[PDB]
Design an enzyme around this catalytic site. Structure first.
Site, PDB file in Angstrom:
ATOM      1  N   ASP A 139      -2.427   1.203  -2.338  1.00 45.53           N
ATOM      2  CA  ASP A 139      -2.223   1.648  -3.719  1.00 45.53           C
ATOM      3  C   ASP A 139      -2.044   0.478  -4.676  1.00 45.53           C
ATOM      4  OD1 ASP A 139      -1.990   3.624  -5.704  1.00 45.53           O
ATOM      5  OD2 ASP A 139       0.204   3.699  -5.525  1.00 45.53           O
ATOM      6  N   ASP A 167      -5.117   5.570  -2.104  1.00 43.47           N
ATOM      7  CA  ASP A 167      -5.023   6.275  -3.369  1.00 43.47           C
ATOM      8  C   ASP A 167      -6.176   5.878  -4.267  1.00 43.47           C
ATOM      9  OD1 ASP A 167      -3.903   8.044  -5.205  1.00 43.47           O
ATOM     10  OD2 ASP A 167      -2.668   6.494  -6.189  1.00 43.47           O
ATOM     11  N   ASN A 168      -6.481   6.744  -5.217  1.00 38.30           N
ATOM     12  CA  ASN A 168      -7.352   6.381  -6.337  1.00 38.30           C
ATOM     13  C   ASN A 168      -8.794   6.076  -5.954  1.00 38.30           C
ATOM     14  OD1 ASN A 168      -4.481   4.633  -7.191  1.00 38.30           O
ATOM     15  ND2 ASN A 168      -5.179   6.429  -8.400  1.00 38.30           N
TER      16      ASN A 168
HETATM   17  C1  LIG Z   1       0.182  -2.213 -12.853  1.00 41.52           C
HETATM   18  N1  LIG Z   1      -0.565  -2.227 -11.591  1.00 41.52           N
HETATM   19  C2  LIG Z   1      -0.733  -3.322 -10.819  1.00 41.52           C
HETATM   20  N2  LIG Z   1      -1.440  -2.985  -9.773  1.00 41.52           N
HETATM   21  C3  LIG Z   1      -1.769  -1.693  -9.866  1.00 41.52           C
HETATM   22  C4  LIG Z   1      -2.592  -0.954  -8.856  1.00 41.52           C
HETATM   23  N3  LIG Z   1      -2.759   0.458  -9.208  1.00 41.52           N
HETATM   24  C5  LIG Z   1      -3.581   0.839 -10.196  1.00 41.52           C
HETATM   25  O1  LIG Z   1      -4.203   0.011 -10.853  1.00 41.52           O
HETATM   26  C6  LIG Z   1      -3.658   2.273 -10.521  1.00 41.52           C
HETATM   27  C7  LIG Z   1      -4.267   2.615 -11.717  1.00 41.52           C
HETATM   28  C8  LIG Z   1      -4.383   3.937 -12.100  1.00 41.52           C
HETATM   29  C9  LIG Z   1      -5.019   4.317 -13.387  1.00 41.52           C
HETATM   30  C10 LIG Z   1      -4.890   3.486 -14.490  1.00 41.52           C
HETATM   31  C11 LIG Z   1      -5.463   3.877 -15.683  1.00 41.52           C
HETATM   32  C12 LIG Z   1      -6.162   5.065 -15.767  1.00 41.52           C
HETATM   33  F1  LIG Z   1      -6.707   5.436 -16.955  1.00 41.52           F
HETATM   34  C13 LIG Z   1      -6.302   5.889 -14.670  1.00 41.52           C
HETATM   35  C14 LIG Z   1      -5.736   5.503 -13.470  1.00 41.52           C
HETATM   36  C15 LIG Z   1      -3.842   4.942 -11.289  1.00 41.52           C
HETATM   37  C16 LIG Z   1      -3.241   4.606 -10.100  1.00 41.52           C
HETATM   38  O2  LIG Z   1      -2.731   5.575  -9.292  1.00 41.52           O
HETATM   39  C17 LIG Z   1      -3.149   3.277  -9.685  1.00 41.52           C
HETATM   40  O3  LIG Z   1      -2.515   3.017  -8.508  1.00 41.52           O
HETATM   41  C18 LIG Z   1      -1.236  -1.195 -10.986  1.00 41.52           C
HETATM   42 CL   LIG Z   2       3.753   5.268  -6.442  1.00 40.35          CL
HETATM   43 MG   LIG Z   3      -2.372   4.809  -7.345  1.00 39.44          MG
END
Ligand SMILES: Cn1cnc(CNC(=O)c2cc(-c3ccc(F)cc3)cc(O)c2O)c1
Ligand SMILES: [Cl-]
Ligand SMILES: [Mg+2]
Ligand SMILES: [Cl-]
Ligand SMILES: [Cl-]
Length: 213
Positions: A139, A167-168
Protein backbone atom coordinates in the site's frame (compact mmCIF):
# COMPACT_ATOMS: atom_id res chain seq x y z
CA UNK A 1 -1.31 21.05 11.98
CA UNK A 2 -1.57 18.41 9.23
CA UNK A 3 -4.45 16.28 8.10
CA UNK A 4 -2.77 13.26 9.67
CA UNK A 5 -2.42 15.00 13.04
CA UNK A 6 -6.09 15.97 12.82
CA UNK A 7 -7.07 12.34 12.15
CA UNK A 8 -5.01 11.14 15.15
CA UNK A 9 -6.55 13.75 17.45
CA UNK A 10 -10.06 12.82 16.27
CA UNK A 11 -9.41 9.16 17.10
CA UNK A 12 -8.09 10.06 20.53
CA UNK A 13 -11.24 12.06 21.24
CA UNK A 14 -13.89 9.88 19.59
CA UNK A 15 -12.72 6.31 20.13
CA UNK A 16 -12.17 4.19 23.21
CA UNK A 17 -8.52 3.51 24.15
CA UNK A 18 -7.70 -0.17 23.64
CA UNK A 19 -10.71 -0.66 21.32
CA UNK A 20 -9.45 -1.12 17.74
CA UNK A 21 -12.92 -1.31 16.18
CA UNK A 22 -13.74 2.11 17.68
CA UNK A 23 -10.50 3.48 16.22
CA UNK A 24 -11.40 2.28 12.70
CA UNK A 25 -14.90 3.70 13.01
CA UNK A 26 -13.56 7.07 14.14
CA UNK A 27 -11.13 7.28 11.21
CA UNK A 28 -13.83 6.31 8.71
CA UNK A 29 -16.20 8.90 10.16
CA UNK A 30 -13.57 11.63 10.06
CA UNK A 31 -12.56 10.84 6.49
CA UNK A 32 -16.15 10.68 5.27
CA UNK A 33 -17.40 13.80 7.06
CA UNK A 34 -14.37 16.06 7.43
CA UNK A 35 -11.29 15.35 5.25
CA UNK A 36 -10.62 12.55 2.75
CA UNK A 37 -7.47 10.53 3.38
CA UNK A 38 -5.80 7.58 1.67
CA UNK A 39 -6.65 4.98 4.34
CA UNK A 40 -7.75 1.65 2.83
CA UNK A 41 -11.26 2.44 4.09
CA UNK A 42 -14.17 0.29 5.13
CA UNK A 43 -15.18 -1.21 1.77
CA UNK A 44 -11.76 -2.57 0.92
CA UNK A 45 -11.13 -3.05 4.66
CA UNK A 46 -13.89 -5.64 4.86
CA UNK A 47 -12.21 -7.59 2.05
CA UNK A 48 -8.88 -7.37 3.90
CA UNK A 49 -10.56 -8.65 7.07
CA UNK A 50 -11.97 -11.66 5.17
CA UNK A 51 -8.52 -12.46 3.75
CA UNK A 52 -6.80 -12.10 7.16
CA UNK A 53 -9.38 -14.37 8.77
CA UNK A 54 -8.98 -16.97 5.99
CA UNK A 55 -5.20 -17.23 6.36
CA UNK A 56 -4.63 -16.34 10.07
CA UNK A 57 -1.08 -15.26 9.23
CA UNK A 58 1.54 -15.47 11.96
CA UNK A 59 3.82 -12.82 10.42
CA UNK A 60 2.52 -10.01 8.20
CA UNK A 61 4.54 -7.29 6.47
CA UNK A 62 2.84 -4.07 5.44
CA UNK A 63 4.49 -1.66 3.01
CA UNK A 64 3.15 1.84 3.55
CA UNK A 65 1.63 2.36 6.99
CA UNK A 66 0.45 5.92 6.46
CA UNK A 67 -1.59 6.69 9.63
CA UNK A 68 -1.91 3.06 10.76
CA UNK A 69 -5.50 2.36 9.68
CA UNK A 70 -4.66 -0.88 7.89
CA UNK A 71 -2.19 -1.84 10.64
CA UNK A 72 -4.99 -1.50 13.22
CA UNK A 73 -7.33 -3.37 10.88
CA UNK A 74 -5.00 -6.34 10.43
CA UNK A 75 -3.46 -6.44 13.89
CA UNK A 76 -6.86 -6.57 15.62
CA UNK A 77 -7.57 -9.88 13.85
CA UNK A 78 -4.20 -11.55 14.41
CA UNK A 79 -4.10 -14.58 16.69
CA UNK A 80 -2.22 -14.42 19.99
CA UNK A 81 1.54 -14.33 19.36
CA UNK A 82 1.14 -13.32 15.68
CA UNK A 83 2.88 -10.15 14.55
CA UNK A 84 2.79 -7.31 12.06
CA UNK A 85 5.78 -5.40 10.76
CA UNK A 86 4.85 -2.20 8.93
CA UNK A 87 7.16 0.09 6.97
CA UNK A 88 6.65 3.83 6.42
CA UNK A 89 9.16 6.09 4.72
CA UNK A 90 7.64 9.37 5.97
CA UNK A 91 8.82 9.97 9.54
CA UNK A 92 5.82 12.16 10.41
CA UNK A 93 3.47 9.40 9.26
CA UNK A 94 5.49 6.75 11.06
CA UNK A 95 5.04 8.72 14.30
CA UNK A 96 1.28 9.04 13.68
CA UNK A 97 1.08 5.30 13.04
CA UNK A 98 2.90 4.49 16.31
CA UNK A 99 0.58 6.76 18.27
CA UNK A 100 -2.47 5.25 16.55
CA UNK A 101 -1.32 1.77 17.46
CA UNK A 102 -0.59 2.87 21.03
CA UNK A 103 -4.08 4.31 21.38
CA UNK A 104 -5.62 1.13 19.92
CA UNK A 105 -3.64 -0.97 22.41
CA UNK A 106 -1.99 -2.94 19.59
CA UNK A 107 1.59 -1.77 20.14
CA UNK A 108 2.78 -5.19 21.40
CA UNK A 109 1.63 -6.87 18.16
CA UNK A 110 3.02 -4.36 15.69
CA UNK A 111 6.43 -2.93 14.89
CA UNK A 112 6.43 0.26 12.84
CA UNK A 113 9.70 0.80 11.01
CA UNK A 114 10.61 4.23 9.66
CA UNK A 115 12.38 3.97 6.31
CA UNK A 116 11.97 3.19 2.62
CA UNK A 117 10.86 -0.38 2.05
CA UNK A 118 13.69 -0.98 -0.42
CA UNK A 119 16.21 -0.16 2.33
CA UNK A 120 14.50 -2.09 5.16
CA UNK A 121 13.51 -5.28 3.29
CA UNK A 122 17.15 -6.49 3.01
CA UNK A 123 17.52 -6.11 6.81
CA UNK A 124 14.48 -8.20 7.80
CA UNK A 125 16.26 -11.55 8.11
CA UNK A 126 19.29 -10.50 10.12
CA UNK A 127 18.04 -7.43 12.03
CA UNK A 128 14.37 -8.34 12.60
CA UNK A 129 14.85 -12.11 12.86
CA UNK A 130 12.44 -12.91 10.02
CA UNK A 131 12.54 -16.27 8.24
CA UNK A 132 9.67 -16.02 5.73
CA UNK A 133 6.53 -13.91 5.57
CA UNK A 134 3.01 -15.36 5.70
CA UNK A 135 1.39 -12.29 4.14
CA UNK A 136 2.41 -8.97 2.62
CA UNK A 137 0.09 -5.97 2.27
CA UNK A 138 1.28 -3.53 -0.41
CA UNK A 139 0.00 0.00 0.00
CA UNK A 140 2.99 2.27 -0.49
CA UNK A 141 4.05 4.20 -3.61
CA UNK A 142 2.43 2.42 -6.55
CA UNK A 143 5.63 2.39 -8.58
CA UNK A 144 7.32 0.44 -5.77
CA UNK A 145 4.95 -2.57 -5.70
CA UNK A 146 6.78 -4.47 -8.42
CA UNK A 147 10.41 -3.71 -7.49
CA UNK A 148 9.73 -4.43 -3.82
CA UNK A 149 7.97 -7.72 -4.66
CA UNK A 150 11.03 -8.77 -6.67
CA UNK A 151 13.25 -7.70 -3.78
CA UNK A 152 11.24 -9.76 -1.29
CA UNK A 153 11.80 -12.81 -3.47
CA UNK A 154 15.51 -12.08 -3.93
CA UNK A 155 15.91 -11.81 -0.16
CA UNK A 156 14.29 -15.24 0.40
CA UNK A 157 11.35 -13.77 2.34
CA UNK A 158 8.59 -15.44 0.30
CA UNK A 159 7.55 -19.08 0.71
CA UNK A 160 5.01 -21.31 -1.01
CA UNK A 161 1.64 -19.92 0.00
CA UNK A 162 2.81 -16.40 0.97
CA UNK A 163 -0.19 -14.16 0.32
CA UNK A 164 0.48 -10.78 -1.32
CA UNK A 165 -2.51 -8.42 -1.05
CA UNK A 166 -2.17 -5.17 -3.04
CA UNK A 167 -4.29 -2.06 -2.59
CA UNK A 168 -5.18 0.36 -5.35
CA UNK A 169 -4.71 -1.90 -8.37
CA UNK A 170 -7.33 0.17 -10.24
CA UNK A 171 -6.92 3.67 -8.73
CA UNK A 172 -4.26 5.01 -8.77
CA UNK A 173 -3.34 1.66 -10.33
CA UNK A 174 -0.10 -0.29 -10.37
CA UNK A 175 0.09 -1.45 -13.95
CA UNK A 176 3.54 -3.06 -13.97
CA UNK A 177 2.89 -5.02 -10.78
CA UNK A 178 -0.53 -6.14 -11.91
CA UNK A 179 0.65 -7.32 -15.34
CA UNK A 180 3.59 -9.03 -13.79
CA UNK A 181 1.81 -11.09 -11.15
CA UNK A 182 -1.05 -12.00 -13.52
CA UNK A 183 1.44 -13.18 -16.15
CA UNK A 184 3.71 -15.13 -13.77
CA UNK A 185 3.60 -18.86 -13.10
CA UNK A 186 4.98 -18.08 -9.62
CA UNK A 187 1.74 -16.35 -8.58
CA UNK A 188 -1.90 -17.41 -8.42
CA UNK A 189 -3.98 -14.22 -8.61
CA UNK A 190 -7.50 -13.21 -7.61
CA UNK A 191 -9.08 -9.78 -8.12
CA UNK A 192 -11.46 -8.36 -5.49
CA UNK A 193 -13.40 -5.49 -7.00
CA UNK A 194 -14.36 -2.75 -4.56
CA UNK A 195 -14.39 1.00 -4.15
CA UNK A 196 -11.84 3.68 -3.47
CA UNK A 197 -11.85 4.65 0.18
CA UNK A 198 -14.69 7.04 1.03
CA UNK A 199 -15.54 7.52 -2.68
CA UNK A 200 -18.04 6.23 -5.27
CA UNK A 201 -15.14 5.26 -7.54
CA UNK A 202 -14.27 1.67 -8.44
CA UNK A 203 -11.02 0.30 -7.07
CA UNK A 204 -9.85 -3.19 -6.10
CA UNK A 205 -7.45 -5.40 -4.30
CA UNK A 206 -5.30 -8.05 -5.93
CA UNK A 207 -4.39 -11.20 -4.03
CA UNK A 208 -1.29 -12.91 -5.47
CA UNK A 209 -0.28 -16.16 -3.79
CA UNK A 210 3.36 -17.03 -4.24
CA UNK A 211 3.96 -20.49 -5.69
CA UNK A 212 7.77 -20.75 -5.32
CA UNK A 213 10.30 -20.74 -8.21
C1 LIG B 1 1.09 10.11 0.87
N1 LIG B 1 1.48 8.80 0.33
C2 LIG B 1 2.75 8.35 0.25
N2 LIG B 1 2.73 7.15 -0.27
C3 LIG B 1 1.47 6.83 -0.58
C4 LIG B 1 1.06 5.54 -1.22
N3 LIG B 1 -0.39 5.45 -1.40
C5 LIG B 1 -1.02 6.15 -2.36
O1 LIG B 1 -0.39 6.91 -3.09
C6 LIG B 1 -2.48 6.05 -2.45
C7 LIG B 1 -3.13 6.99 -3.23
C8 LIG B 1 -4.51 6.96 -3.37
C9 LIG B 1 -5.22 7.98 -4.18
C10 LIG B 1 -4.74 9.28 -4.25
C11 LIG B 1 -5.44 10.21 -4.99
C12 LIG B 1 -6.59 9.85 -5.66
F1 LIG B 1 -7.26 10.78 -6.37
C13 LIG B 1 -7.07 8.56 -5.61
C14 LIG B 1 -6.37 7.61 -4.87
C15 LIG B 1 -5.25 6.00 -2.68
C16 LIG B 1 -4.61 5.06 -1.91
O2 LIG B 1 -5.32 4.10 -1.26
C17 LIG B 1 -3.22 5.05 -1.79
O3 LIG B 1 -2.65 4.11 -0.99
C18 LIG B 1 0.67 7.83 -0.22
CL1 LIG C 1 -4.35 2.49 5.58
MG1 LIG D 1 -4.05 2.53 -0.63
CL1 LIG E 1 8.84 3.01 0.35
CL1 LIG F 1 -14.93 3.23 2.39
Amino acid sequence: DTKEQRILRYVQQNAKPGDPQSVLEAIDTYCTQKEWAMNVGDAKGQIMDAVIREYSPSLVLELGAYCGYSAVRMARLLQPGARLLTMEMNPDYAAITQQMLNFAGLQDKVTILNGASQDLIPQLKKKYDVDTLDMVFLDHWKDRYLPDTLLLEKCGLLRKGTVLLADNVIVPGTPDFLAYVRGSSSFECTHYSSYLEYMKVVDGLEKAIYQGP
